[PDB]
Symmetry: D2
Subunit: 424 residues, 4 copies
């Protein structure tokens, strides 16, 4: 229906023999002194080396990485490169080059400041991007934001290649080339959504998350996680926890065990902003995917309140919603306590899965609007979480049909540790 | 005192004599309908042969099936040589002998294949959970094997050896458990469910593959029901369709297990197997203090499916005690409508917790008071269950306590089939 | 450059979605009751199932096999299928079909007679085939031969894909489509030559024989070999031993150990004809590859004499040569005994690497023709080893430039065990 | 049976919980600035970290390595560690420590001087060592040599564990503990002999060299080899080429292809001494294994003459032999040129497989002694290749029945590139 055609300008192939394409970066360590650099070469393996240097020092260094390939049904990937640059200086612009053997391409990024209590930083929020014309408009709006996002928190559902026949993994390549104009210059922090599962036993593809996991690496060992699908990083004044809605989280499982330990490592005097990313929302008053989040909610919601998470970001529902600060953790089967109540130790739950997908919005809502829902609207767009300091962060939502500087919704987050005031 | 595990020199742990004698012999159903058997054993002195020699009493024709040997390491433990061999194309309702260790020390055993699946085929299933290797465990197993109801197959709802309570999960305690349970499971299949003591996720000793020792030692015929994982699968046996679930695997919407179960419930034909039985480790209904509400997560996913498909019974363990629910459901909840109380629902399964076979000697006696309406009967005693199918409409469940005689049932109830005879059996 | 271009008729793709191509069969067991069926599908994995039935009876059965794929530099193969049909009846025509899920293709083969002393059987001899116009002519001559070859003994150097840039493995696919018109209907017995090594560290391909070994499977475990590159089969009245010139054969290595035990298992009272295949010739009087066979000769020649091997076939030299029965096994470094002498207990050594390759013949011969060389000529062509009974086999060599019925060289073999009499020309 | 029993003092287990045992080192790079550190822990995996520092400066650094395990029939190995220390300073004594988590053990080595034309260096030659009482004597004689060996060139046949029932791989562990008293302190340069093949299809062990290759790593990638069984290193003024008698070496095979290119890289103005190690001798006048080396000789002898190899060392024959400088490379099947002739561009071929094995010597010799044989004797012992400078190196053979300072055979090597005097 509305997916951009293969010959669209956003899908053009970087010219020259074996030119790197689908270039993308993300944070490569726990505190921001490292960057994972990733790209694909189509004509031959090529080299996995990255040349990099700061604008100031100017001393050029080489980092070595690794190449991998995969198959999916009758698809054969090109040559995938992942290379980690390490021991970078904080708050510094670096250039990097890939394709060192045949066609070199140059890019740049800016390391975050060192982690600290009072360190401003602006996060973009994008979920369920896809590669429709709507997707392209959302990305344009983010790039043109006057607030200037410095990192994208991506709440999952990347390419939607699995909607195509045999999950036509070409649509992973096109999505890589489409997003390069943003993610080659600033990290995107990856969350796994249901369109990344790609469980297709009918064509003998039964390894969950396979194409996504080959194409997008994350620094999961840096937080002592055993799986790429849940992990944490710190960046500026934020501690960001990424969870996997489609992995196990029963008591005693790896993800549950890891998250319980991870929450104990949080130090709000170093990173006052505690942020959780997951694909499927625990609070959601849209009909589509209603109550799908209940299972994870039974395991994790009380932990979020106990540790005073500031905000939880999710996607999956193709629309926008912002909850009140509520909790629904008092239920004991026979005591009848199953209704959410205002709770100032609880996070705000934000659904931001509306960046475009394959061109369809979720407009059917549960009626009436429940007390726990502060704002909801079925429009395309993206968010910005703008940390001013340890007490204040400004969240805004920009609609695709508005000007790039118009915020149809916006709210001040008051920090749950340093300033726990009603921000209704 | 504090430790009730049986000592390493106990008679139940003795090593069968002879060079490279097979030990830890165990069998389970090896296909979808009962014409195959997975034969498993360990040799300790050298790899040995994975051949099984076998013959029916009725035809006396000796045959050879070939299998595979495997090994694993766990921290500083190195396993012996694990053999799994599937015997196929067995005749129904037929007694077979089989032999393992064909190269050096041969040992002979026997089993009886079930009748062909069918509407009115009687069959008696044992129910054992959280068995362990304490003296209480030995007593439960004795009561099972001395039962005049005579179980023909054990439905085992998880937590096997409890080896993971030992330092570095001392996998020697898996070997002892295998030698101990052999006197039953070498002669009749046990249907394996994975419990939380099978997870053995221990990153501090760089052992991060969930279920590894369990999965090397206990194979299941999971491909036969088009499952992609040993931890959830289905078998049919006599008049029963048995669905085994994994509490400690993913079951979110779109995951392999969730996808497999949705499809498997639509393949169920109650005109062929009228008794629909679900095994899982962690109970969805549980009024004991220990592990209270741990099953809530899977309940939000699957309970409505069990009601829609009129599951007859759900068996679970994990709680070290016995409980039998009423037929109830709690599937009307919509966040803001306040409908969170379980109600009687004749379309729902009975939920039975039967994790009381012994573990490491500890019973769970703290119950939430008063007994809730959804709970029909509960008791903190060691024992085992029996699910005795008479025909498409009637099955008789009974619970036997270790402190009673082997022929005494302390709880019992008639199941009226939800598909063929849905009359009120409360 | 005389390689046939890609649009040649011999390289055409079988029509229909995911149609099997590059179909080829070989013996699948030790004695001839089994057949390995191999093929590639290009559009998607497909089924590895093979449907088969005998022409007279007709009970259609299914055999299940395996699919594999590989990469070589920036090449990605299609989906390779290998499936063994077992427990066939001897001397029986069978139909078989592949591509069961989408586009089915049907072929046939005739199982050999049960092994016996006097069982006639006609073996083709083809080496260093390649895909030039000369290659196509040789294959044409073989398939039109009035002698009617029933199984090809192939002494190595298949596709010559490794002469292309990055070994362009597309030229393995084309060769499979070209050869199918013969090897889909009768087994070819595969020997690994030096163009199969494909050792290319400069493009990080360091696994020897990788493309060859993915595409061409052999029944090596049936003779207790641990490697596909050396193995043994029996067919009709012949015991055939296949060796790897480019694998280790020092004392104590797998191949040396295996050959030693295998020769002990030979029973000439059951299979009278003992035949060795290897790529590199032990006896070779051409300048090209002169004396490359010496290393293996020092290890195995004395064994071939001890066990009275009837014939040894090799390729590698792009020409034809037939030796006298000779041996060179008395050398002791300082005793001066280094000349081949006549030896009635030795095999005849035949170089038959002249099926066409990429169109070049090896014409530089060392002069004069040495006493050990009975006949040699630098012409393209192929051979036929035509077994008549336990005492007599007729060998003939047919040149591409002659008519298909013209034997330019021809000799009767007297079996070294059952008719140990001088058969020299 | 003359193998030392399991309770011999040489086989004592280092005490302490999870104490490293079987510690051994070898050169870790092409030119000598790196060291592969190897050891086994038996009680649990432990850490693969190596702590090391130079004795003068003293800055303590950590290198991270890798742990591996293997099975052979019914044997399960301990936890094998391999860790490369890199970027070391030349001609410098270093301390290193293994077993950093529970029981630490400390050793030392001395890096060689930087490669160069006139750098002196003393190499021990040991072959077919084994773990018999003769083996212990040879190793004692080597340790006590007044010439002071600084690196051992080991021409193969290590533990002889494969003579035991099911190749009882415990006899690899005992050999590792026995040789530690030398190889933990100076590199041994490993060659693979026939007792390392361990190809045993009758007990379903069909991977050649499996136990050896898990236990003893070599820096084969540093010379662009694709296999651990052939490689080259440079140390001081020597270029050392290690070949594999029981791998493939036909034309076009990886080993053949590698050797041809490696010989092209030798620069005799940087390393004047060109040394080849292989297990099976190309020249051998003993009855045992006579002419087993002919196959490799047909492929590589002409290359050795063409590139003027100084010396070729081999083992396999359980005895000592030293050849004249000869070549036998003119044979063309019919031309009758099959007798070795004096050739001053050819190497000397030395058989030194007499360090003890399991207690048997090879005494039956071809009679009369052929002209290509300069000296031969069936006694246990070891050799020393003592490089003085670019022109002169002194080779000596010490018998176990003699005093540790007595040379029963002794010859000057005159360098084939800088001083090709008739020797
Ligand atoms: C599917 O399985 C269920 C469970 O097994 C079947 O239900 C059982 O059916 C059997 C009959 O086959 C019932 O047993 C019978 O019970 C009567 C009534 O006993 C009661 O009253 C007596 C006085 O009237 C008293 O003496 C007795 O102590 C008890 O209090 C018995 O009278 C009867 O015994 C006599 O008849 C048999 C048959 O000729 C003789 O052999 C005896 O020697 C006696 O002369 C017999 O034991 C049993 O009670 C049922 N169990 C339950 C839990 O309901 C079911 O059968 C079907 O359903 C039942 C309710 C009846 O309608 C059956 O007729 C009917 O077939 C099985 N379904 C099918 C389709 O087979
Ligand atoms: C084993 O196989 C060989 C080769 O086929 C047999 O030798 C061949 O026997 C043929 C007879 O069946 C000969 O053909 C005849 O030749 C005569 C003389 O010109 C013609 O008049 C007649 O019409 C036939 O064409 C053929 O010449 C001969 N081939 C050779 C190379 O010698 C062999 O048969 C046995 O040996 C020969 C020499 C004769 O004595 C046969 O009669 C005899 O049976 C076969 N062995 C057996 C046991 O059958
Ligand atoms: C696997 O690793 C565990 C953990 O280290 C081993 O268990 C430990 O063995 C130690 C012996 O090396 C024990 O220490 C000694 O205890 C005795 C008796 O109290 C003291 O007299 C002595 O001075 C030592 O302190 C240690 O207690 C034990 N640790 C634990 C947690 O059990 C294990 O070794 C195996 O089990 C023990 C019980 C001994 O019998 C060992 O000999 C035996 O190998 C390791 N297992 C394997 C298979 O290697
Ligand atoms: C695997 O890698 C090889 C080696 O590069 C690829 O072949 C090469 O493909 C390039 C095009 O990308 C060819 O260069 C072009 O040649 C034409 C004709 O002269 C010229 O007009 C262009 O401007 C450009 O320079 C190159 O010749 C060719 N080399 C060969 C065929 O040897 C090959 O396509 C790759 N295969 C796969 C499956 O990716
Ligand atoms: C963190 O950033 C906040 C957003 O800029 C600060 O609040 C803003 O402070 C301005 C000057 O102090 C004032 O003009 C703005 O109206 C105000 N904005 C809002 C939404 O309140 C905040 O400043 C502190 O907190 C406020 C409430 C005042 O009391 C200021 O005097 C404080 O300095 C910043 N907080 C810190 C700790 O720096
Ligand atoms: C390399 O070392 C050789 C062994 O020491 C030197 O030969 C020795 O030179 C001594 C003078 O320093 C002399 O006393 C010894 O007789 C002699 N030893 C032998 C076995 O010849 C060699 O010296 C050169 O070569 C010899 C033959 C003499 O002509 C010396 O005067 C030369 O300097 C050393 N070569 C070099 C280049 O240093
Ligand atoms: C995508 O958006 C960019 C920037 O807004 C625009 O230049 C480009 O034409 C768009 N491409 C498509 C296919 O809509
Ligand atoms: C190959 O030979 C066949 C049979 O002689 C012929 O029909 C075909 O045209 C030839 N193809 C070539 C020469 O490309
Ligand atoms: C081995 O040799 C050493 C050094 O000479 C000696 O101290 C030791 O006792 C010997 N051990 C045996 C078992 O011969
Ligand atoms: Cl749980
Ligand atoms: Fe989505
Ligand atoms: Fe339990
Ligand atoms: Fe050729
Ligand atoms: Fe030896
Ligand atoms: Na909970
Ligand atoms: Na039978
Ligand atoms: Na879900
Ligand atoms: Na060769
Ligand atoms: Na040898
Ligand atoms: Zn989604
Ligand atoms: Zn449990
Ligand atoms: Zn060749
Ligand atoms: Zn040897």
């Amino acid at each position: 229906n509305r997916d951009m055609p293969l010959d669209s300008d956003v899908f053009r192939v970087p010219p020259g023999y074996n030119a790197p394409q689908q270039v993308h970066i993300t944070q490569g360590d726990l505190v921001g002194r490292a960057m994972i650099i990733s790209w694909v070469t189509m004509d031959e393996p090529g080299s996995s080396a990255v040349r990099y240097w700061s604008e100031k020092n100017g001393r050029k260094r080489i980092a070595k990485g690794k190449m991998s390939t995969y198959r999916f049904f009758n698809y054969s990937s090109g040559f995938i490169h992942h290379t980690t640059i390490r021991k970078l200086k904080y708050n510094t612009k670096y250039y990097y080059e890939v394709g060192l053997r045949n066609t070199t391409r140059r890019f740049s990024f800016i390391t975050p400041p060192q982690t600290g209590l009072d360190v401003p930083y602006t996060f973009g929020l994008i979920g369920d991007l896809g590669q429709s014309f709507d997707s392209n408009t959302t990305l344009s709006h983010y790039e043109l934001s006057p607030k200037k996002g410095q990192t994208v928190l991506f709440v999952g559902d990347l390419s939607y290649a699995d909607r195509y026949p045999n999950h036509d993994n070409v649509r992973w390549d096109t999505w890589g080339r489409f997003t390069e104009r943003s993610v080659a210059y600033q990290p995107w922090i990856w969350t796994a959504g249901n369109h990344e599962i790609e469980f297709a036993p009918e064509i003998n593809e039964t390894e969950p998350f396979k194409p996504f996991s080959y194409r997008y690496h994350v620094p999961y060992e840096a937080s002592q996680s055993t799986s790429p699908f849940w992990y944490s990083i710190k960046r500026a004044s934020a501690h960001i926890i990424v969870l996997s809605s489609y992995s196990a989280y029963g008591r005693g499982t790896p993800q549950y065990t890891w998250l319980k330990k991870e929450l104990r490592k949080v130090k709000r005097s170093e990173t006052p902003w505690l942020i959780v990313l997951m694909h499927s929302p625990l609070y959601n008053s849209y009909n589509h995917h209603f109550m799908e989040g209940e299972a994870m909610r039974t395991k994790f919601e009380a932990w979020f309140v106990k540790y005073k998470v500031d905000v939880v970001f999710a996607g999956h529902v193709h629309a926008y919603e912002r909850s009140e600060r509520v909790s629904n953790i008092a239920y004991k089967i026979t005591n009848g306590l199953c209704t959410p109540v205002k709770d100032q130790s609880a996070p705000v739950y934000i659904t931001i899965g509306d960046a475009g997908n394959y061109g369809v919005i979720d407009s059917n809502m549960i009626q009436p609007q429940p007390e726990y829902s502060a704002f909801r609207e079925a429009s395309f767009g993206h968010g910005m979480f703008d940390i001013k300091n340890r007490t204040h962060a400004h969240f805004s939502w920009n609609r695709n049909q508005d000007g790039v500087a118009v915020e149809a919704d916006s709210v001040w987050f008051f920090n749950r540790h340093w300033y726990p005031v009603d921000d209704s």
